[PDB]
């Protein structure tokens, strides 16, 4: 129950993915692709090749990896699951977040969809599975903010995959507990346990009737299950390493499999010996999405740990251990921004020297929350030595690179232990007093808040688009807003109840 | 720890029935001394009165004989039908003759830890013919005894010396050590015959490998005999032809129990590697292995009443094992395992053979289990403490008339 | 032959006899040095080796009962370092016969990258449960611990806190596997710890299941050579005995006395099952030798 203040150093848009992509959704009515990014940002793209700039809009509200997304209500509504222990309801057409569900106690790892009744299911590391009626989530208001909760009991370990059939009658959970578990979503009754796999299961598929099941597992095997006989039918072993993604055609005859070994095959379930290597991606495959616009699948979208999202056409697929691939160059390529992978705080505890996936070293400023200059592909260790400062300043913040952008975290334990003189820091009579870097930063983050009125500190200003985050330690996100959005009426009403006491002291009382 | 009293399967909820429990009349737990294992034998007397089922079990020195009522309330434990007390060597195994069995006479032979075998008629208590009483045929303890399928007089016994002996009720044993003459030499086994003009009782001496022969089991048809020894070799023979049909080496250790499938196409085997091993008869190859026990396996048995052979339904088998870990396991053999598409070739590696997982794995006793019998209405288990537990099948607990 | 039990010397005699009958070990002993002199005497008072142990190690200076596993582990590594120090004028023959290697693997559940951390061992300390076998106790030794919830593992490849699985698995099989059954476990109270008299069965043949698939000859066959039995109902209030196999016949060494015994009589040294906490004549240290 310890509140922490956090903010991200980034550009205003960041219209490309700053990290890898966990899930993919596809709206064929509008020809739009949805990418769930490991940078907490869901982006709407355009698969129509007549355009050259596929970017449409960015849906950002999550504060941690967005692990899975589901598109419902003929593309109107989008449901997202993320590592910030939240499940958010979105308006997929306009592109803004509608509601936030905080029932999970850990990473929400996967979602499941049932179109015939508009039912979505959320599950993750908290070992829990919740069932949500989509039509009741879209009608959530400030007065009627609660909703009936229906959860399934069963799993003995963390859940990594979840799948429902189209009818809304079979739901299967895959888990680091190697056994698959099946329920009836209407009565919540346990139907069967499917034993066989020897490792975690990250991929699950069900046919429309809910009678067969495809499962990809980290043991390197794909198993076709019979829910009628309650047993395994066939076991395909076309990969070397852990299978993580699965897709199937409309006839449930061919399975498209991907995973850690960067290979992507199209195997026939009836005859496994006919395997067709589609392509060998550059990064491990996390999620795949078939193009469902023809009797055979024309193309398939692939998401990897890299920030780029590719599309591979399967034109010559019916005419073809397969060492020769079908495709080498993708049909479409959605570009990806680089990810900051290494970070080093300097001795003055104000400037940060980073290095991204393109081996580009950059010089940042934590106090002003700005990028000073890009330094290109220079040596990273030697630049740290060349930027050495003969001074000691205590630690007053922490940095994490899970989103690939710079995320700074402030904690009450050591936020204010940063007394630095103003002259040598870079400010002006020239009185040169001792300034507290931590307390001076909290006043600039809440600069547009009318309760903290001089406008700011004077000495500096953080970017207005800087997202400020209030949360709990290893905990749930409490409230999120931009720096400029502190002046909104209902947004300032939340700042009266969400901001902890130790932040109110430095910003309002001028306690220092 | 607390023992389980029920378990669920796809068929339904199996429930333990304590009011159907059989043990000593005093009901004090038999001390789990090294001693010899408590065994159970059943027999039906043509169910002429509906109470045609008879139960026999041994507990250390005592050997009881009651009327088995199945899922109904057990018979009065204080009033047995027959009771035998052995001050000398102790009983270790027994079996009824299901053919020559009626309400007036029932043939029951009992093995002992001295090597002796004794024919007993418990319902009349009249006859008592001892076999190998002088310990001249073999001095080691007997392990498994059973009548020959379809015979009325012949029966086969197996001892810890790694030998088997065929007897006859009508014959008499020698006053001296019998002299043998060779009949058939084979791969790691030998069969001899008694060289005697007079009809000596040891009809033939069947030497089976090294180490102690832990158990043998005839095929359901009768034609074949499956033997397991302490050296870890499962040897199945043709009983009429007297020659080797197939062999199988355990992963390690040595095979304690063995049994046949109802149709006789498969054989499962428990041993000292905490593993049950499924073996195909027609192909003479290992098809599966099961890891679900914390200690050695004691008894394995197929369940004919939950087995679907042939069909357009798929072929599926059901068999159980009980181990020295006081746990009961149930296993399913399905077509994905049956029909998939120190030598290791006749002892495949762990990667070359499927690895089964049990449907259930429940602790059902405080002591090591030694009995697992599948009946029409119930499952029968027993521990070293001498409690014969009865597990009612789903729907077989109550009848309505 | 037999060794003289001067009093509380059982745990030194028991392992000494058990150590001898290791045919590869008794061979290369021909060339501390007090043990090589006592080995040549057999091929019997051990006063030259007993008194040398009291002055060498201060832990064994008292005249009380002690742990055979503590002396077995100390005796092996003490002979190993003097062999390595005398070889200055790296793989000693003491390590070539007894030293195995197990790796502590850490596996991130998201990216599935495995990092290793090897550990060399002479004895394999394995925990004990009631009504189990050594092959199941080895499975319990190689169980998979999961780091999750508030104790997530930071993965450098993922740049975030993810779930992870720690797991121990033998990497290199030793020529002679020494299985120490941890029967002496803390009492969880201020009272002296008790002796676990659980029935742990052990076969004569043995193969290991908890082997890393990276090795080649991981499923080699083993054979029981010797086993150090321990009588008594307490941690330091008992007596050590040794079952052992010179040739086909099995021998029993109770201190000075020697007696031949059948192989089926080992069943009495598995352990109690009624849990009456009696003598509990049970096996404590097991010696398995490779076939090839
Ligand atoms: Zn990772």
Residue numbers in the entry:
A (entry chain B): 13 to 332, 344 to 451, 454 to 478, 501 to 559
B (entry chain C): 11 to 321, 362 to 391, 509 to 568
C (entry chain A): 35 to 65, 77 to 88, 97 to 142, 164 to 366
Quote the paper.
To further investigate the molecular mechanism of the activation of USP46 by WDR48 and WDR20, we prepared, crystallized and determined the structure of the USP46-WDR48-WDR20 complex at 3.1 Å resolution. The overall structure of the USP46-WDR48-WDR20 complex is very similar to that of the USP12-WDR48-WDR20 complex. The tip of the fingers subdomain of USP46 is stabilized by a Zn2+ coordinated by four conserved Cys residues; and the active site assumes a catalytically conducive conformation. WDR48 and WDR20 bind to the tip of the fingers subdomain and the base of the palm subdomain of USP46, respectively, and are located remotely from the catalytic center. The USP46-WDR20 interface is mediated by both hydrophobic and hydrophilic interactions, and involves two loops at the base of the palm subdomain of USP46 and several top surface loops of WDR20. Specifically, Thr347 and Ser348 of USP46 form hydrogen bonds with Glu534 and Asn41 of WDR20, respectively; Glu279 and Asp293 of USP46 form salt bridges with Lys259 and Arg516 of WDR20, respectively. In addition, Val275 and Phe283 of USP46 make hydrophobic interactions with Trp306 and Phe262 of WDR20, respectively. Intriguingly, there is only a salt bridge interaction between Arg243 of WDR48 and Asp386 of WDR20 via the side faces of their WDR domains. Mutation of the residues of USP46 involved in the hydrophobic interactions with WDR20 (V275D/F283A) disrupts its binding with WDR20, whereas those involved in the hydrophilic interactions with WDR20 (T347A/S348A, E279R, D293R, and E279R/D293R) have insignificant effects on its binding with WDR20; and all of these mutations have no effect on its binding with WDR48. Conversely, mutations of the residues of WDR20 involved in the hydrophilic interactions with USP46 (N41A, E534A, and N41A/E534A) also have insignificant impacts on its binding with USP46, whereas those involved in the hydrophobic interactions (F262A, W306A, and F262A/W306A) significantly impair or completely abolish its binding with USP46. These results indicate that the hydrophobic interactions at the USP46-WDR20 interface play an important role while the hydrophilic interactions acts a minor role, and that WDR20 and WDR48 can bind to USP46 independently, and the WDR20-WDR48 interaction has an insignificant role in the formation of the complex.
The USP domain consists of three subdomains named as fingers, palm, and thumb. The catalytic center comprised of a conserved triad (Cys, Asp, and His) is located at the interface of the palm and thumb subdomains, and the fingers subdomain is involved in the binding of Ub. Besides, USP12 and USP46 can also bind with WDR20 but USP1 cannot; and the activity of USP12 and USP46 can be activated by WDR48 and WDR20 independently and synergistically. USP1 is responsible for deubiquitination of proteins mainly involved in DNA damage repairing, whereas USP12 and USP46 for deubiquitination of proteins mainly involved in cell development and cellular signaling.
